[PDB]
Design a protein around this ligand. Structure first.
Ligand code: CL
Ligand code: MG
Lengths: 243, 231, 241, 111, 204, 244, 235, 250, 240
């Protein structure tokens, strides 16, 4: 034993226990999801209201990379911010050299390689976040999810955090009942519902809903936050479904 | 236990003990309170002394004409972080002729503290900060934890016995937020809030430390007979 | 017992971290196979998409390293992509410096040398992957070269990798014992893919749908992967005889 | 060949009284025979009851004033809001100027 | 100003029958001024001889450098260096200063101890080898030496005849050069004996 | 991090000893015995090769006695590979001194420095020390014939006669008994071989198990000659002294 | 083993807390601040009678207006003093003025936490920095290896510190004269010292606005010791 | 990141042992048998091609390697370590010798350079020793033919004949009886094949054995004509057929 | 680079590596320093376990740092060479930049500073050496004698000893050395230095080294016979 004391050490199983412990920090965090729609993607997140003293709509969790990519994450919030700062540097250097904005699959690998690099040495700690991200590029819409190990895949729907099982079950229903696809405005409504349904796992404290989206028709392929009437419409739809 | 030797090591339950131990240093520190309205933002700090011959350790540091913070924990770490803020506030002014947004100041502190929690050799910061400021979007109050977490709040408190002051502000939320265009009444609410965290000792003239910033009010610190008005 | 944590010798003259990296290779529970035709080199690999929420098009362990060289990986995807990116960079640098396309075996050696360094230098861990490089080399013809975490590499007539490699290996051994040649005597690559799939079916004892497999084909001057519909056409031809 | 210097003209004047001081300067900014601005301020309030004007090459004058104002700011931070005396400011400015001894600020300065 | 002609001097080497000869003047100057009449420009590392013309500080520096390198060669190889090998070492060492060269004109002379074959070679200041069968020249009177050597030289000369040919080539070339003279030395080299003769010449 | 695996090669024990230096000395005690004896008219270096084989090519072999320059030689006891690293540094050295001052390096100056390099590995860098002990035999015009030794601690001392490697305790007693100040090279040669013959762990001392060398003013007139003995020459001197 | 910059479960840096234990083993140093000046006094503590006591330099000049006394691993103080002197003189170069005592103390304390894996460990010495400036007048600071500094009216550091601090608690008042402060330092030093206090095993010093920082002669201190004995015998 | 292992991983134990070197030698012991025999007019080096799989093309894996035209090498122990050592040995022969002296290094000096590389891996920071023993055969003008062994410690010894790896103890005994100073190259090849048969279990033929020689100059393998002094490489790897021909007269 | 913190504090406030460096000094051969009215004498022990030694070429225990200053030591021999070399370089550097030779106090302060630097620098261990530095300042007739140790502390001494059995010879010096009237002549100073070593040394043959340093760069090392005469006179007076 002692294989779990140092990062980048293979156990006799062939496992990196330090990365598996980083996943526990992710599982401890709040719920966040992603939904791939007809011509774009929708991101949503659960924000726990620890106190009445928290200013509403100020502590923004979802982050934009470039102008066309949205990023959300669950776990250690600072680790997520660090990862997004790198993502922005990667996106900036890509555009600087190649002119075109970074494609989503290209961007996904840039993060993937960086996260994976933090599993190669004992002088660094693995990332304590699972990151859901995506957007619209020349080849259409893309949704990705990235784990502490550096592992990532493309997704139709994605979920992570303490209420991931509940969320995943709801996402699976949408995939089955909508093979032809889901619209952007529908995906926003469904996203609100899923966060509300996933809140049963964090039911002690009340929460604040935060949604963003990229859509070719609705946002011209740019990342925007869901605000005002459209946000309230989604909250009303979500509240109606739980009752 | 076996996973608290350095900052680069997760525990089996996904915890970072060195960060948690750094968080513990804040709880040992003296109490400080932060609260704001729409027009002004106020810091109130209980200063601590070594003995009767000693001075009372300063808790509040100015970062710019429109921004500053109060500390709780390792004072030298606050000096490092406040110096960083001073430089960032100053970079924004010299390069962009732009006063640094308080929200962006919090994002910079978060990112600086985070690098110390993921790398081998270094250590987490052992101090908590309450940043107040007035920028283009009005008054602001931030709470900084050395884990990296930064939170924008209407009011809060950190340090020893800080739960008492935090409960008071949670009740008074609707009242003190409305105190607009009245700095003295906002400070009164802050002095009354920090009083809920006191035991045995009371607020004396060289014990209390207050700071304020607002619409037409540069960040200024009040100590000595300047705070006798509020005792 | 710190000789089991970093890559230094144990009293038995062993490197335990290298041995445990070999065990990480089978963590994905995927079996791969590579064979050579007359004009081509074919590589097939099991494809497993357990989650319905996954986009199956993005789930892949086959990589296009250069126009001529293809690579299949046995091991976790983060290390797989780490190796893939490096191989792509090396192949591109080689062409720029030396004025001709990097050969499959030369790339394999280069990646094997990099792997050797991780077994000697302490700060770098081994990658828990086995890399199978395939091409139709302009000098050597159809080529299969495989690399492992120990830094070992060698050319192959055919090969297999994964949890059930031995069953596939013996199945291929027995075929080449009959034919008494170092390749699949077949003109078209389509029929070489059909051979590869058939012999994996026989060895593993499982039937395959179009979404259960992943195929890579190397011809002269290009390497390419097959789509689900291209594989379906391949499965139909097998069933009809 | 690139000439990093220029001449923006202007003239400045400082006179010291018994209990007061004046620092004057024209507001004209020029290159060669053209006028850039008829009103471009050249004399600045730098804080701590000190006024300053760097005359000659405007880009170097603006940089020096900007640096001295910054020096005043950090003097307060580092020394408990102590007032920077005029003699201390003068000495500080010497070190700002000589820091570029081998690529000078092309300005005549008066405080 | 021209570093190759401040100090002045000349070196010439010739092959014979089972022998080589190498000779040099003894002058060291500061342009017009004669400073020393004892500045020998020929050195030997075992049985390999090296003559160096040009800037005197570089002549002295290179001698000390090749002494350094040949002494280490011998300790590791457990044998003395041969002329063909030494020639490559000189070329290597000069070209490593390609863009800040030693201002010299070296000349190698010696007999391979194994094959018995006479060997001479010359270089430009940055290592280009001139492996000649007949003769090699270097210095401020190189033009003069070329004319004398090309007219006086004939192949397969005996040591005592070769001595007279190289000596007359040097002496008469030196007397048509202001920056060469003030004495002269000739080395006659055979497989296992070497004679060194100081010549009598005009001292102006 | 990496701290977990650091042996800490450059630290004191509670008793004030350097662990790695002491353990390096323990390694050297198992190495073949090397002996140096200084006479009025020269120096002798004798050394025992470790359990050789009949198929070892002896005439082209060198594991004990090395040449640093024309005036100075060394006998090795310990890791041969480690010794060669230091030997090449010492050779470059003697040449640097010769290039600078145009004079052959004084023996002590060369010794002091190899010893300073060894010292460095015991105080900084975190690397293991060199598992080597040298016997330096040399000549210069200041002190004449000189014998020195250096060990992994980087400490060096001068000697009239000295042994390193295996059985130094027994060997030093025998040397202390039979050595005299007015001794000559031919006598010193005999003493060196007799001492090895009695201290050896082998059944008998033969030519194939020995390396031998002398530094003599026995060269034509005022100059010094190094003689690394050949296998046949070692065989002859063994018969002459009456050992075989 | 374990990191040098490691936090304990209680939220303290192990190495900083361990350095504080080394300071407790050090010889006593006492400082008293008054409106007429600041007095600094130390226990020399010679390990042997053959040791020439006048070479023991535990009170040190930083500038004309700033002095310094030390306690603990005194060898560690030399680089701190060097930095302080450089800081004091450098500020005089840049600003043509004396440097504030607080600013000087802050500059010294900035070195304290520059240790990790920069120097390899914290300083094992505490400093009493006494001085005068025009803004805040006569000041006494206590600079620790934690990077923290407190201002004090009176302070004792070293082996007899807690006993001396309790005595300074009762004796100090805002109207103390310089002569009274001198005798008070001698009184408390004599109380906590192992050996009998005299002019050779104890040293006094002060800082005044007029004369600046001065280390007292052994002849001058001897008279203050004799003056102390008589006034204690007076009642 | 940064390589933070700047300290030695090989250290002296209380008994004076260097553990990692001993353990490296143990890894060499487990390795496949290889041998070398020196003749009057040549040197031979040989080893078994232990194929990991019959599907693997054992021709692509070369255990015997050319370092210079007149120097060859074979190993026992860890194959990947050997491969990188050959790459470095080839390069150092150029950088530290050929680019200076305009000719290839003699055997002993190239061996010295290889030995230096292996010694440094025994003392430098954050590395383990190489897990191989090398047998380096070669020829040069002034030293003639020679055969050297190089161990993980960096120590090297010249041999008339020797063996390393699995059955080295038995093989060295076999060579002691057969070796003499009057052996011709063909006699040494014959003895090499006899010695190697004892350590091999399975198939024993040209396809399972790898054997090379340092012998006469091969002008046919030079690749060009016109320069009399350039007469071709003395290193030659024997073909599968050439081995089988000598196994019939065995 | 190797950055590991080897010298660190322990729970009880001790730096063990510095304390273990003092144990290396305790193991080292005895060294003694005594200053008279117009001179300083440095005595050193030579352990007689090592015979067959060449005393001409063996590194002497007392080292000249400059023409007017000397340095002896106790502890690790190899470590002492590094300090001496640094001290010698600094001595020439001081002459080169300030046009005066170093004072004995300055040279001591430099050497002590080097020793201290090695107690809080990463990747290095403390010097296992204590030194006695003695001499006369330029144009000064007052004798100077200083001591240093691994921790980096230094101080001036009327008389002092370091190394093995230094406790015994210090005991001797404390009762025999009078401050009011120190050794007036060179003879008296050397005699007292030899007497003090005879409490510990064993035999008074080649085991005692003596070096006398006088003002104005007048340094000389006594021979075996000269020292043997002191040994003879001391014991003949003792037989009474
Ligand atoms: Cl490579
Ligand atoms: Mg003339």
């Amino acid at each position: 034993t002692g294989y779990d004391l140092s990062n980048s050490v293979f156990s006799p199983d062939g496992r990196n226990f330090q990365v598996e412990y980083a996943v526990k920090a992710v599982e401890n965090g709040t719920t966040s999801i992603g939904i791939k729609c007809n011509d774009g993607v929708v991101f949503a997140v659960e924000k726990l209201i620890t106190s009445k003293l928290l200013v509403p709509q100020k502590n923004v969790k979802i982050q934009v990379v470039d102008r066309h990519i949205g990023c959300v994450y669950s776990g250690l919030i600072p680790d997520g911010r660090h990862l997004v700062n790198r993502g922005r540097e990667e996106a900036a250097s890509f555009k600087k050299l190649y002119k075109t904005p970074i494609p989503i699959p290209a961007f996904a690998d840039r993060l993937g390689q960086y996260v994976q690099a933090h599993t190669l040495y004992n002088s660094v700690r693995p990332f304590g976040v699972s990151t859901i991200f995506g957007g619209v590029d020349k080849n259409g819409a893309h949704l990705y999810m990235l784990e502490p190990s550096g592992s990532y895949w493309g997704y139709k729907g994605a979920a992570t955090g303490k209420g991931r099982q509940s969320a995943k079950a709801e996402l699976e229903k949408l995939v089955d009942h909508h093979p032809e696809g889901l619209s952007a405005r529908e995906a926003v409504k469904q996203a609100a519902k899923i966060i509300y349904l996933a809140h049963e796992d964090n039911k002690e404290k009340d929460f604040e809903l935060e949604i963003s989206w990229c859509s070719l028709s609705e946002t011209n392929g740019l990342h925007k936050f869901v605000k005002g009437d459209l946000l309230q419409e989604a909250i009303d739809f979500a509240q109606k479904e739980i009752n | 236990n076996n996973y608290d030797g350095d900052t680069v090591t997760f525990s089996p339950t996904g915890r970072l003990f060195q960060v948690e131990y750094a968080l513990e240093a804040i709880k040992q520190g003296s109490v400080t309170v932060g609260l704001r309205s729409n027009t002004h933002a106020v810091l109130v700090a209980l200063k601590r002394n070594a003995d009767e011959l000693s001075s009372y350790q300063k808790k509040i540091i100015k970062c710019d004409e429109h921004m500053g913070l109060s500390l709780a924990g390792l004072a030298p770490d606050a000096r490092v972080l406040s110096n960083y803020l001073r430089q960032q506030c100053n970079y924004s002014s010299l390069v962009f002729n732009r006063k640094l947004a308080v929200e962006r100041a919090g994002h910079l502190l978060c990112d600086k503290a985070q690098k110390n929690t993921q790398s081998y050799g270094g250590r987490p910061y052992g101090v908590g900060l309450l940043i107040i400021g007035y920028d283009k979007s009005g008054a602001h109050l931030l709470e900084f934890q050395p884990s990296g977490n930064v939170t924008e709040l209407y009011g809060t408190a950190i340090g020893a016995r800080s739960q008492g002051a935090k409960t008071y502000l949670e009740r008074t939320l609707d009242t003190f937020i409305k105190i607009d265009g009245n700095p003295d009444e906002l400070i009164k609410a802050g002095v009354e809030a920090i009083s809920q965290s006191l035991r045995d000792e009371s607020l004396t003239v060289d014990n209390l430390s207050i700071a304020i910033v607002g619409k037409d009010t540069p960040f200024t610190i009040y100590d000595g007979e300047a705070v006798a008005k509020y005792i | 017992g710190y000789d089991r944590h970093i890559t230094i010798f144990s009293p038995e003259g062993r490197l335990y971290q290298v041995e445990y990296a070999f065990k990480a290779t089978n963590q994905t529970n995927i079996n791969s196979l590579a064979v050579r035709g007359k004009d081509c080199t074919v590589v097939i690999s099991q494809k497993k998409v357990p989650d319905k929420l996954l986009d199956p098009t993005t789930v892949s362990y086959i990589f296009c390293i250069s126009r001529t060289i293809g690579m299949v990986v046995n091991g976790p995807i983060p290390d797989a992509r780490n190796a893939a990116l490096r191989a792509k960079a090396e192949a591109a640098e080689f062409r720029y410096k030396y004025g001709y396309d990097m050969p499959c075996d030369v790339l394999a050696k280069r990646m094997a040398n990099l792997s050797q360094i991780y077994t000697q230098r302490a700060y770098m861990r081994p990658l828990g992957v086995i890399l199978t490089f395939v091409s139709v080399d302009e000098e050597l013809g159809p080529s299969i070269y495989k690399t492992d975490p120990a830094g070992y590499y060698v050319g192959y007539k055919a090969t297999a990798t994964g949890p059930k490699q031995q069953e596939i290996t013996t199945n291929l051994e027995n075929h080449f014992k009959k034919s008494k040649i170092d390749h699949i005597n077949e003109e078209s690559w389509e029929k070489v893919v059909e051979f590869a799939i058939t012999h994996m079916i026989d060895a593993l004892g499982t039937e395959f749908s179009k979404n259960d497999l992943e195929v890579g084909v190397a011809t002269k001057d290009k390497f390419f992967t097959l789509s689900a519909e291209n594989i379906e056409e391949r499965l139909v031809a097998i069933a009809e005889q | 060949q690139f000439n990093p210097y220029g001449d923006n003209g202007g003239t400045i004047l400082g006179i010291a009284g018994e209990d007061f001081a004046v620092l004057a300067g024209d507001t004209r900014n020029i290159t060669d025979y053209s006028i850039n601005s008829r009103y471009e301020p050249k004399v600045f309030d730098c804080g701590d009851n000190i006024v300053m004007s760097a005359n000659g090459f405007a880009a170097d004058g603006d940089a020096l004033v900007k640096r001295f104002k910054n020096s005043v700011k950090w003097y307060h931070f580092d020394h408990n809001d102590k007032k920077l005396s005029i003699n201390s400011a003068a000495r500080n400015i010497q070190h700002l100027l000589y820091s570029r001894r081998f690529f000078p600020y092309y300005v005549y300065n008066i405080i | 100003s021209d570093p190759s002609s401040i100090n002045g001097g000349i070196v010439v080497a010739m092959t014979g029958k089972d022998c080589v000869a190498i000779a040099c003047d003894l002058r060291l100057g500061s342009q017009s001024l004669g400073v020393s009449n004892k500045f020998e420009k020929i050195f030997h590392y075992g049985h390999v001889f090296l003559g160096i013309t040009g800037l005197a500080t570089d002549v002295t520096t290179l001698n000390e450098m090749f002494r350094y390198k040949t002494n280490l060669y011998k300790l590791k190889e457990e044998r003395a260096i041969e002329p063909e090998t030494f020639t490559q070492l000189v070329s290597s060492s000069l070209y490593e200063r390609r863009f800040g060269p030693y201002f010299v004109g070296p000349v190698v002379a010696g007999i391979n101890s194994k094959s018995g074959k006479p060997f001479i070679a010359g270089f430009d200041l940055i290592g280009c080898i001139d492996e000649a069968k007949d003769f090699i020249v270097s210095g401020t009177a190189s033009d003069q030496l070329f004319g004398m050597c090309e007219s006086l030289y004939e192949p397969n000369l005996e040591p005592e005849d070769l001595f007279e040919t190289i000596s007359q080539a040097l002496l008469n070339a030196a007397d048509r050069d202001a920056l060469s003279g003030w004495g002269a030395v000739v080395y006659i080299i055979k497989k296992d004996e070497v004679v060194k003769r100081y010549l009598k010449m005009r001292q102006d | 991090g990496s701290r977990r695996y650091d042996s800490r090669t450059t630290i004191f024990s509670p008793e004030g000893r350097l662990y790695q230096v002491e353990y390096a000395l323990e390694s050297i005690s198992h190495a073949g015995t090397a002996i140096g004896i200084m006479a009025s008219d020269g120096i002798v270096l004798a050394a025992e090769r470790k359990v050789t084989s009949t198929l070892l090519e002896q005439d082209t072999s060198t594991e004990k006695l090395y040449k640093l320059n024309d005036k100075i030689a060394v006998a090795v006891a310990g890791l041969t590979a480690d010794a060669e690293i230091l030997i090449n540094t010492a050779r470059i050295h003697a040449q640097n001194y010769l290039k600078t001052y145009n004079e052959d390096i004084p023996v002590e100056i060369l010794v002091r420095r190899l010893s300073d390099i060894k010292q460095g590995y015991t105080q900084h860098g975190g690397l293991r020390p060199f598992g080597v002990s040298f016997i330096y035999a040399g000549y210069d015009d200041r002190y004449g014939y000189q014998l020195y030794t250096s060990n992994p601690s980087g400490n060096y001392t001068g000697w009239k006669a000295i042994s390193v490697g295996a059985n130094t305790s027994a060997a030093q007693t025998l040397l202390q008994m039979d050595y005299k100040d007015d001794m000559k090279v031919d006598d010193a040669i005999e003493l060196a071989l007799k001492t090895l013959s009695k201290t050896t762990d082998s059944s008998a001392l033969t030519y194939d198990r020995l390396e031998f060398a002398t530094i003599r003013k026995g060269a034509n007139d005022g100059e010094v000659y190094q003689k690394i003995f050949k296998p046949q020459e070692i065989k002859d001197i063994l018969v002459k002294t009456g050992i075989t | 083993d374990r990191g040098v910059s490691t936090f304990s479960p209680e939220g303290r840096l192990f190495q900083v807390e361990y350095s504080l234990e080394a300071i407790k083993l050090g010889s006593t140093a006492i400082g008293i601040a008054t409106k007429e000046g600041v007095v600094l006094g130390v226990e020399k503590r010679a390990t042997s009678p053959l040791l020439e006591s006048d070479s023991i330099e535990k009170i040190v000049e930083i500038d004309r207006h700033i002095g310094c006394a030390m306690s603990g691993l005194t060898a560690d103080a030399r680089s701190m003093i060097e930095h302080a002197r450089t800081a004091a003189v450098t500020h005089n170069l840049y600003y043509d003025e004396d440097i504030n005592v607080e600013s000087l103390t802050q500059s010294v304390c900035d070195l304290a936490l520059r240790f990790g894996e920069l120097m390899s460990r914290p300083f094992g010495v505490a400093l009493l920095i006494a001085g005068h400036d025009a803004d805040d007048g006569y000041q006494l600071f206590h600079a620790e290896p934690s990077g923290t500094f407190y201002r004090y009216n009176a302070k004792a550091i070293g082996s007899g510190s807690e006993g001396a601090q309790a005595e300074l608690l009762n004796e100090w008042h805002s109207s103390l004269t310089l002569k009274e402060a001198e005798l008070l330092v001698l009184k408390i030093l004599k109380q906590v010292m192992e050996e009998k206090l005299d002019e050779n095993n104890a040293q006094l010093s002060c800082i005044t606005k007029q004369d600046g920082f001065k280390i007292y002669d052994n002849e001058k201190t001897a008279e203050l010791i004799k003056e102390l004995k008589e006034k204690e015998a007076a009642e | 990141m940064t390589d933070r292992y700047s300290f030695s991983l090989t250290t002296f134990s209380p008994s004076g042992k260097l553990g990692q070197i001993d353990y490296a030698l143990t890894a060499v012991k487990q390795g496949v048998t290889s041998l070398g025999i020196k003749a009057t007019n040549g040197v031979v080096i040989a080893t078994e091609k232990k194929s990991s799989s019959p599907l693997a093309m054992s021709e692509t894996l070369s255990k015997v390697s050319l370092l210079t035209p007149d120097i060859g090498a074979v190993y026992s122990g860890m194959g990947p370590d050997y491969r990188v050592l050959v790459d470095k040995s080839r390069k150092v022969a150029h950088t530290s010798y050929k680019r200076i002296y305009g000719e290839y290094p003699p055997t002993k000096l190239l061996v010295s350079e290889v030995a230096k590389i292996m010694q440094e891996a025994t003392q430098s920071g954050g590395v383990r020793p190489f897990g191989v023993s090398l047998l380096i055969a070669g020829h040069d003008e002034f030293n003639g033919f020679s055969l050297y062994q190089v161990d993980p410690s960096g120590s090297y010894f010249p041999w008339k004949a020797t063996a390393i790896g699995k059955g080295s103890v038995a093989a060295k005994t076999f060579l002691e009886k057969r070796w003499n100073d009057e052996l011709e190259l063909e006699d040494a090849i014959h003895i090499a094949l006899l010695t190697l048969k004892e350590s091999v279990e399975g198939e024993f033929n040209g396809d399972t054995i790898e054997l090379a020689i340092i012998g006469d100059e091969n002008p046919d393998l030079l690749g060009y004509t016109g320069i009399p002094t350039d007469k071709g490489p003395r290193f030659r790897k024997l073909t599968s057929q050439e081995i089988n021909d000598r196994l019939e007269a065995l | 680079g190797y950055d590991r913190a080897l010298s660190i504090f322990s729970p009880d406030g001790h730096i063990f590596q510095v304390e273990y460096a003092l144990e290396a000094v305790k193991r080292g051969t005895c060294a003694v320093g005594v200053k008279g009215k117009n001179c300083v004498v440095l005595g050193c022990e030579r352990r007689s376990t090592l015979k067959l030694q060449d005393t001409r070429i063996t590194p002497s225990k007392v080292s000249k740092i400059d023409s007017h200053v000397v340095l002896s030591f106790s502890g690790l021999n190899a470590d002492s060479r590094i300090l001496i070399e640094k001290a010698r370089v600094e001595a020439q550097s001081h002459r080169l930049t300030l046009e005066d030779p170093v004072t004995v106090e300055y040279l001591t302060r430099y050497v002590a500073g080097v020793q201290q630097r090695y107690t809080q620098s990463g990747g290095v261990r403390p010097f296992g050496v204590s030194t006695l530095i003695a001499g006369f300042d330029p144009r000064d007739d007052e004798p100077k004698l200083y001591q240093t140790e691994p921790s980096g502390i230094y101080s001036s001494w009327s008389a002092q000893t370091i190394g093995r059995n230094s406790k015994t010879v210090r005991e001797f010096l404390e009762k025999n050395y009078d401050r009011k009237e120190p050794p007036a002549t060179v003879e008296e100073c050397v005699k007292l230095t030899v007497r003090s070593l005879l409490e510990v040394v064993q035999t008074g043959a080649k085991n005692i080294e003596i070096t006398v340093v006088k003002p104005d760069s007048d340094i000389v090392a006594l021979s075996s016979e000269e020292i043997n005469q002191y040994v003879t006179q001391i014991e003949q007076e003792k037989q009474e």
